[PDB]
Symmetry: C3
Subunit: 128 residues, 3 copies
């Protein structure tokens, strides 16, 4: 399938059978990260990535791109676990310009420092 809309953003984060069933107590890390048009942190910011993930002693990720720029106004929410420096995550929600949008995002992670840059390539397959 070809997507009815493609978007690319970067956001910047600073840290600080077979196997049996496995549980543990979790701790939540909450983040609020700048989203930029290109790779550099000092390139134009177009919103904030806000969400959370988990440490055990944690493939789980929930976050929203809160977009607020001259061309993009809305939110896109993603949720799920995926264990490669690259993973897919489902679009799970949309508001504003991204009202009723659906699709997937490919997340590529440049790890450096406590500095992580995440390339997020959004392919929408339903667009309103």
């Amino acid at each position: 399938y070809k997507p009815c809309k493609n978007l690319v953003f970067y956001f910047h984060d600073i840290l600080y059978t077979k196997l049996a069933p496995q549980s543990h107590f979790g701790n939540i890390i909450v983040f609020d990260d700048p989203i930029t048009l290109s790779h550099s942190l000092s390139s134009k910011q177009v919103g904030r990535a806000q969400g959370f993930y988990i440490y055990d002693t944690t493939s789980w990720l929930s976050f929203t791109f809160v977009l607020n720029s001259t061309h993009h106004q809305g939110t896109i929410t993603f949720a799920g676990a995926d264990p490669a420096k690259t993973r897919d995550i489902s679009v799970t929600g949309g508001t504003g310009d991204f009202f009723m949008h659906r699709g997937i995002a490919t997340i590529t992670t440049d790890a450096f420092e406590a500095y992580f840059r995440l390339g997020v390539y959004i392919k929408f397959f339903e667009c309103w």
Copy 2:
């Protein structure tokens, strides 16, 4: 677009570039709140709002309207971050009567006390 179904509920909660990337440890607050047809807490209850949000030292919200009334039987789930006394949040899931439903909700907050009344105006744009 005009919604194929509109619903209005209130639920009642009782408490107790630019910026750099920002993380912290989070704490979860879980809530289980009555949903009513109208503004007053003592008006007919039609279900419970059950979910969680986060304190840092937190625009993130995940919750489900568990509806159980003479006219509404099902669940509606919402998730996302939005930083106005009014915000939008995406429908992310539905069961029962709201099976395969999609759309957005506008949330208006009356803050008082530790008492918060939230007006939730659901506009579905896909209805089964």
Copy 3:
């Protein structure tokens, strides 16, 4: 409606008006559980169930089936609260083979020990 695709999996977990508005601090339990084709833990594993739930002192559940088998390659994510030994939960996300899929799952719980087997019956009503 008849589903365009039906799937059945089991996963195995090992523990260890009216009512006023109710909140509390929550603690998160994270789990990573084997998914099998049939009831027995020693039957073929087809992936891992990875997500979290909450203890108060908690009908909330978020998890992803990370499927990795000879016939199924993708993820399916579910989220929501539902208070019966059986409950429904909405599909909220999909990737890979389950890209753009939507529907509901019925979850049946066999409680034993700290051992819980969950029968998950997925009915997709949108398939790509």
